[PDB]
Write a protein that binds this ligand. Structure first.
Ligand code: 3JO
Lengths: 103, 86, 141
């Protein structure tokens, strides 16, 4: 079953899908293909939880019924700057305006 | 193959090329990064979700859920969809 | 053009509302006039008696947004094989992002106020041009 994801770091957001049965490491390989940084230089997170390479996305709570096309689940990303890993940091999206009166 | 769509506040959304070609406007701007000076991230993120939704549920027998739009973003989203022709 | 044929050959049908909308079935009568039938709440079904060669289409009962029946616009009951009813599966289409936005805006702004919204005139017109069965009958013709 497909899960639909947003992989987020700083002001970058990747929209992609993966199998529930695929692994965290395999998701790093996908990020590698896009952002050109190897898996050993990536940490992936569900909220503040560091995800282990050998776990399946399903095990880590990304399921086909919650990680939906129209409402994808967020996976946090942090890169290793040279020696040590930066802290997970995801820039929020902008804020919508106040509802007008007429609405 | 992916393209980068950049919001007016500098958010970089990386989505599959074929998904982004849902918008004829984006096709033209490509024909592989596009800046959108009038589309903020809270709108453009939703547009990307729309692409994913459309591609997934077009020509599909499995029942179709409603594409959700918060009241707060509906106006700006309308304006983006009109510009993007999607 | 789009009118039911007066066949007299009965046909049992299950109207199955697999959409989140309240649904309005519309029968095109023998003169091509749309004739509204009782609504179906979201997720519900009705066993109904119709006839072969009769034309139906389905709409959101509140807003008249177009719905699909068995993946197309129109439904014509056919011959029942071995006494089994014909299924009419009513579903949401995949709306364009624009039409979906227009739906949500329409559902929040009273028509009198469309002029107050800060948008290009052409979107005012788009909002005001509500989904309408008569219009679609001309579009299908
Ligand atoms: C005068 C007559 O009975 N004519 C037959 C044809 C016929 C049959 C026998 C002999 C001669 C002619 C005929 O075509 N009838 C038509 C008829 O019965 N119709 C038109 C459509 O095919 C549906 C059917 C009909 O009204 N069926 C009753 C019905 C009642 C409710 C509902 C619905 S729809 C959503 N919920 C419900 C409960 C759906 C169907 C009417 C009476 C509307 C003209």
């Amino acid at each position: 079953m497909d899960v639909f994801l947003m992989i987020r770091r700083h002001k970058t957001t990747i929209f992609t899908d993966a199998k529930e049965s695929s692994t965290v490491f395999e998701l790093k390989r996908i990020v590698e293909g896009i952002l050109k940084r190897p898996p050993d230089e990536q940490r992936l997170y569900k909220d503040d939880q560091l995800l282990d390479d050998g776990k399946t996305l399903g095990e880590c709570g990304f399921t086909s019924q919650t990680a939906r096309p129209q409402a994808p689940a967020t996976v946090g990303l942090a890169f290793r700057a040279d020696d040590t890993f930066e802290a997970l940091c995801i820039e929020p999206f902008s804020s919508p305006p106040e509802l007008p009166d007429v609405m | 193959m992916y393209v980068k769509l950049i919001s007016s506040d500098g958010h970089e959304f990386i989505v599959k090329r074929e998904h982004a070609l849902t918008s004829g406007t984006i096709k033209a701007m490509l024909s592989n990064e596009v800046n959108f000076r009038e589309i903020p991230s809270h709108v453009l993120s939703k547009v990307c979700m729309y692409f994913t939704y459309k591609v997934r549920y077009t020509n599909s027998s499995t029942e179709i859920p409603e594409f959700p739009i918060a009241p707060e973003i509906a106006l700006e989203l309308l304006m983006a969809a009109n510009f993007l022709d999607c | 053009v789009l009118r039911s044929v007066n066949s007299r050959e009965p046909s049992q049908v299950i109207f199955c509302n697999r959409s989140p909308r309240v649904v309005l079935p519309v029968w095109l009568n023998f003169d091509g006039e749309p004739q509204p039938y009782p609504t179906l709440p979201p997720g519900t079904g009705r066993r109904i008696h119709s006839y072969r060669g009769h034309l139906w289409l389905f709409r959101d009962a509140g807003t008249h947004d177009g719905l699909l029946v068995n993946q197309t616009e129109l439904f014509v009951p056919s011959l029942n094989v071995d006494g089994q009813p014909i299924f009419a599966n009513i579903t949401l289409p995949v709306y364009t992002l624009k039409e979906r936005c227009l739906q949500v805006v329409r559902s929040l702004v009273k028509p009198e106020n469309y002029r107050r919204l800060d948008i290009v005139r052409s979107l005012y017109e788009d909002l005001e041009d509500h989904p309408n069965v008569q219009k679609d009958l001309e579009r299908l013709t």
